[PDB]
Every structure is written in C-alpha cells, then in structure tokens.
From a paper:
The SWEETs mediate the facilitative diffusion of sugars, by allowing solute permeation across biological membranes down a concentration gradient. SWEETs possess seven transmembrane (TM) helices, consisting of a pair of 3TM repeats and an additional helix that spans the membrane to connect these two repeats, resulting in the ‘3+1+3’ arrangement of TM helices. Their bacterial homologues, the SemiSWEETs, have only three TM helices. Previous studies have shown that the SemiSWEETs assemble into dimers to function as sugar transporters, and thus they are considered to be an ancestral form of the SWEETs.
We also obtained a crystal belonging to the different space group C2 (Crystal-II), and the structure was determined at 3.0 Å resolution by molecular replacement, using a protomer in Crystal-I as the search model. The asymmetric unit contains four EcSemiSWEET molecules organized into two separate dimers. Whereas the conformation of one dimer is almost identical to that of the inward-open state in Crystal-I, the other dimer adopts a markedly different conformation. In this alternative conformation, the extracellular halves of the protomers are separated from each other, while the intracellular halves approach the central axis. Consequently, the central cavity formed by the dimer is open towards the extracellular side. Hence, we designated this structure as the outward-open state. In the outward-open conformation, Phe19, Met39, Tyr40 and Phe43 of the two protomers form a cluster of aromatic and hydrophobic residues through van der Waals interactions. These interactions seal off the substrate-binding pocket from the intracellular environment. The temperature factors for the two conformations in Crystal-II implied that the outward-open conformation is inherently less stable than the inward-open conformation, suggesting that EcSemiSWEET probably prefers the inward-open conformation in the lipid environment. As the inward-open and outward-open conformations were simultaneously captured in Crystal-II in the absence of any sugars, the transition between these two conformations could spontaneously occur even without any substrates.
Numbering used by the authors:
A (entry chain B): 2 to 93
B (entry chain A): 2 to 92
C-alpha cells in the first residue's frame, strides 16, 4: 500500500510534468525541432518498459509508460508525416 | 537475470534518448523556453522513483532515475541562475 502509493505519486509526476508540451505539439502540429531518431529510441525504451512491468508485476512502471507511449507515439507519427510533406513539397 | 536484462535495455534507451539535448543545454546555458515548474514536477517524481526503486528492490528503475536526475538537476539549477541574472540586470 505504501510502496504502491509512493510509486503512483512518482508515476504521476514523471509522465504528466512535460505532457502539456506533447499535447500542445499534437494539436498545434509544430514539429519543427523534433528529432525522429531520438523519439524512436525513446519509444523503444517505452515498449520495453511495458514488457519489464509485465515480467516483474509492477503496476506503476506499467501504467506510466503505457500512458507515456500514447503521448509520444502520435508526436512521432505526426513528425514523420510533416517530413514526408516536406519531401514532396521540395520534390515539386 | 533475463528480467533485469530487459529492464536495463529499457532503462538505457529512455534515459539516454534525449540526454544529448540536456548535455547540450548544460554546456551552452541556453535555458530559454525552459519551464521552472515543469522541471520542479519532473525532479519531484524522479526522487520519488528513486524511493520506489529502493522500496521494491528494483535495480533497473533505480539507476535509471539516478542518472536521469543528473541530467535534469543541472538544467534547473542553471535556468534559475539565468532567470536570476536577467532579473537583477533588468532591475
């Protein structure tokens, strides 16, 4: 109870601290400085964390990175789309 | 062993994906567009995670948040100095 309470408090603060910038970026679609490669690595760690949570039976590390997956994944997808739009625009 | 192997792989990628940007910002001291508050929140969870790693004997989540603390703490310390320096200069 004490351990899980502490972890959920740790969870909440880590994933939701900089979440407004992810949400803002998704809405605004301003991916001008975003690194595609740096997000790929980040997401690789995230999916792995989910797997690590399943193995160790840890709710906190599971729920945290599952949410952090869903906040970062669209940012990566949108960033890739914007670059693709740049490729076609430059090609024209 | 195989489980701890998975955690370290997860740890390495998450804490070192965006580490270059923090190291960059530390040296350049360009703390413009950096939230004091959002970093306050961040580091609070980090230390809480450190406490969680101790509590559940999870080596992987502990060292992950240990290192991540040394990437973030200088950024907040430096951005406080910058905002301070801007304030007295403006005054």
């Amino acid at each position: 109870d004490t351990i899980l309470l502490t972890g959920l408090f740790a969870a909440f603060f880590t994933t939701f601290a900089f979440a407004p910038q992810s949400i803002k970026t998704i809405r605004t679609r301003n991916t001008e400085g975003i690194s595609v490669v740096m997000y790929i690595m980040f997401l690789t760690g995230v999916i792995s964390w989910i797997a690590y949570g399943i193995m160790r039976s840890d709710f906190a590390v599971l729920i945290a990175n599952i949410v952090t997956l869903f906040l970062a994944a669209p940012v990566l997808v949108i960033t890739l789309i914007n670059r693709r739009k740049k490729h076609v625009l430059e090609s024209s």
